[PDB]
Design a protein around this ligand. Structure first.
Ligand SMILES: [Mg+2]
Ligand SMILES: [Mg+2]
Ligand SMILES: [Mg+2]
Ligand SMILES: [Mg+2]
Ligand SMILES: [Mg+2]
Ligand SMILES: [Mg+2]
Ligand SMILES: [Mg+2]
Ligand SMILES: [Mg+2]
Ligand SMILES: [Mg+2]
Ligand SMILES: [Mg+2]
Ligand SMILES: [Mg+2]
Ligand SMILES: [Mg+2]
Lengths: 226, 149, 64
RNA sequence: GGGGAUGUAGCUCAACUGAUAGAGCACCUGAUUUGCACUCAGGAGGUUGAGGGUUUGAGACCCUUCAUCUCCACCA
RNA sequence: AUCAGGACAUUAUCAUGUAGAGAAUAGGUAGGAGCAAUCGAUGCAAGUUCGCUAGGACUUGUUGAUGCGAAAGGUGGAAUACUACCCUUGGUUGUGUGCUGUUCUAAUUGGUAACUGUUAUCCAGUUUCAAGACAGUGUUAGGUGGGCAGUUUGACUGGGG
RNA sequence: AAUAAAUAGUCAAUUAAAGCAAUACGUGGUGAAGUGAAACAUCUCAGUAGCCACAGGAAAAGAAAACGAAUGUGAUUCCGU
């Protein structure tokens, strides 16, 4: 076994890997286990009983958090109504010209929002943007006729969720300096949404494990793990 | 089920001990060898009483023995710089009674039957091995100072 | 006969139900086994007792 | 009535569990003998049982079916 | 009862790793680009890990700080540190089970022999011999089973078949 | 007695048991088939006949770890509904 760092032995010593830590207590502990000088993320890993090979069991969508996750997102809007997207708070606007900029390698944005008309031009870039995950999806409400309202929703803290190949969802709930109640409310909203998103084909226990962690922390097995 | 063995066997228990084995091996083959009675007088509680009391006197002996041994290992303030001639004879031939004239009161009692030194009680101008055993199990070594008064 | 000597509990006659629930009379016999019971260190008779009675004797330290 | 597995050159089969289909046999050609056969090597012979779904990546993973098999069940 | 063996999931035990591309071993896939250093480096010799036959680390030192270019370039479907987590696989005993394989015996068995009850081929007791957790017996569950039992084996029909 | 003790065994004394009938009633064990179902195997016949054991003047049962749905009844047995 690799020797744990000096700070982490202390942090791991603060965490019982066996105990079923109640949410609230976990959030307060997760904030305390942040050993970093930078403001870490508070992240949740939810292990689901999903066969993501099954299209009906592929879980993907978006959730609007009640509270901001405290990460600024740079939004590129690809729309004919560039003015309304800018007034909605898009950081970049443009039509086909920005698609050409993306083709030339400009990627100083975190999210693409587009109108249905532009997928044919963006489809040619699927190899570059898709590998980076920047490709808009209707299932995420990133393909919409009302680009300005969606832009506002993402600035309000709307995030996409996706199951990995193992049926886990990984999402960032907030920052370590965020209020503990806000992180708890964000965590509840995700768990209730996940519960609501049950495929009719999934028999038995749907959530196998919930883990909260920081960017640089141990995982604090949420109450009722494994 | 719990069964007490009265003498020693290689596995399980040593003399008076208790082992929680299945019905299994002997039972009607254990009684004839009466090497492990079910309990003392077959009574769970009565065996409890008996074995408990026996090993309890045993461990109070353990306690007094530990006391003696450690007060020796920590103190051993038994000093005798008994006048030593050097070229002429000089040794620790001060039996042990003079040596125990410094044990009780100033230090641990150090019972008479507990220092199992040999008939020599030191016979050199130098420190030698002092054998004190609180019991037959605890081994105590004393190497006190010596010199010329 | 197939019976205990300490108690008197013996066989039970009943039905042999099969598929189509056809009736044929059958008999359940007790698990008679031989055992030796000491009594005041003497008279170690080789009695034939059932396994239930054997368990009762075993839990009673061979008392009967 | 379910449960599982199989389907790939004409045949017999690897299956290349996604980073772009192969072997023996069937057949053509070449060499190959006085002749037959034998023998050796190239070429040809593949739309991966079919349809749908996912991702940048599936004959290959998933759904639906088709055919086959082995199991069970199988008191209208 | 004991012993030995693997088999099993596996306690406990660390190594091991390249689609290509990208110097990159990328095992994958998550938070996200650092973080260790007298508990001491870099370069080299001596061993070994190892196939992508490249690469990988380690320890046997020197050494004494570098950094480090997988911190920060770099291309790549996949990416860089480090928190990860899962690891691929085996590594040794291994855990507690059963699985065949021995030895020993007290259970138990005997239509071996002897003695006694006893003027007695039975029976009982005590031995001795031979087996032995087998066997036999009880319960449960498969297979074979006209040996045996209970029944069935239609109507029309220029009589019946 | 085997075999020291002790049992097995042997002997003696005392006390009870045997059997019968009332072509009838009770309890328990065991327990069919003719027949019906318009066949027959489920079922019925039927726990009947029969066989055996034990009685008694009756026997059996009997004083709630109960009925049961309520401000409920309060051993067993037998009759009507
Ligand atoms: Mg009948
Ligand atoms: Mg005979
Ligand atoms: Mg047996
Ligand atoms: Mg049978
Ligand atoms: Mg037949
Ligand atoms: Mg017949
Ligand atoms: Mg009939
Ligand atoms: Mg006719
Ligand atoms: Mg005719
Ligand atoms: Mg009949
Ligand atoms: Mg009839
Ligand atoms: Mg009465």
């Amino acid at each position: 076994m690799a020797k744990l760092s000096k700070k982490m032995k202390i942090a791991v010593g603060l965490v019982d890997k066996t105990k079923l830590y109640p949410l609230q207590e976990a959030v307060d502990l997760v904030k305390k286990t942040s050993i970093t000088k930078f403001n870490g993320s508070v992240d949740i890993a939810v292990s689901l009983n999903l066969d993501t090979t099954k299209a009906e069991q592929q879980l993907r969508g978006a959730i609007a958090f009640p509270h901001s996750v405290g990460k600024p997102i740079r939004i590129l809007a690809i729309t004919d109504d560039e003015k309304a997207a800018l007034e909605a708070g898009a950081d970049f606007v443009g039509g086909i010209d920005k698609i050409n900029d993306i083709k030339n390698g400009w990627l100083d944005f975190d999210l693409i929002i587009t109108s249905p008309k532009f997928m044919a031009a963006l489809g040619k870039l699927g190899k570059l943007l898709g590998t980076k995950g920047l490709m808009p999806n209707p299932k995420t409400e990133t393909v919409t006729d009302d680009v300005p309202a969606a832009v506002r929703a993402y600035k309000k803290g709307k995030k996409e969720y996706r199951a990995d190949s193992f049926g886990n969802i990984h999402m960032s709930l907030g920052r370590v300096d965020s209020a503990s109640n806000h992180l708890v409310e964000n965590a509840l909203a995700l768990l209730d949404l996940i519960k609501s998103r049950k495929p009719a084909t999934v028999k038995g226990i749907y959530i196998k494990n919930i883990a909260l962690t920081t960017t640089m922390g141990p995982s604090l097995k949420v109450k009722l793990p494994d | 089920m719990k069964v007490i063995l009265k003498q020693d066997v290689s596995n399980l228990g040593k003399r008076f001990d208790v082992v929680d084995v299945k019905d299994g091996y002997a039972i009607h083959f254990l009684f004839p060898k009466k090497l492990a009675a079910p309990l003392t007088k077959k009574s769970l509680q009565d065996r409890d009483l008996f074995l408990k009391k026996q090993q309890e006197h045993y461990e109070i002996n353990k306690a007094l023995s530990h006391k003696l041994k450690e007060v020796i290992e920590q103190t051993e303030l038994h000093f005798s710089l008994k006048e030593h001639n050097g070229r002429p004879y000089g040794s620790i031939i001060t039996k042990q009674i003079i040596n125990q004239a410094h044990t009780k009161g100033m230090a641990l009692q150090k019972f008479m039957f507990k220092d199992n030194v040999r008939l020599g009680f030191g016979d050199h101008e130098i420190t030698l091995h002092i054998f004190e055993d609180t019991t037959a199990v605890l081994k105590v070594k004393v190497t006190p100072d010596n010199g010329v008064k | 006969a197939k019976k205990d000597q300490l108690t008197l509990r013996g066989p039970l006659y009943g039905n042999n139900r099969s598929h189509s629930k056809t009736i044929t009379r059958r008999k359940w016999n007790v698990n008679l086994q031989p055992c030796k019971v000491k009594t005041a260190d003497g008279k170690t008779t080789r009695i034939l007792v059932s396994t239930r009675t054997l368990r009762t004797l075993k839990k009673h330290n061979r008392l009967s």
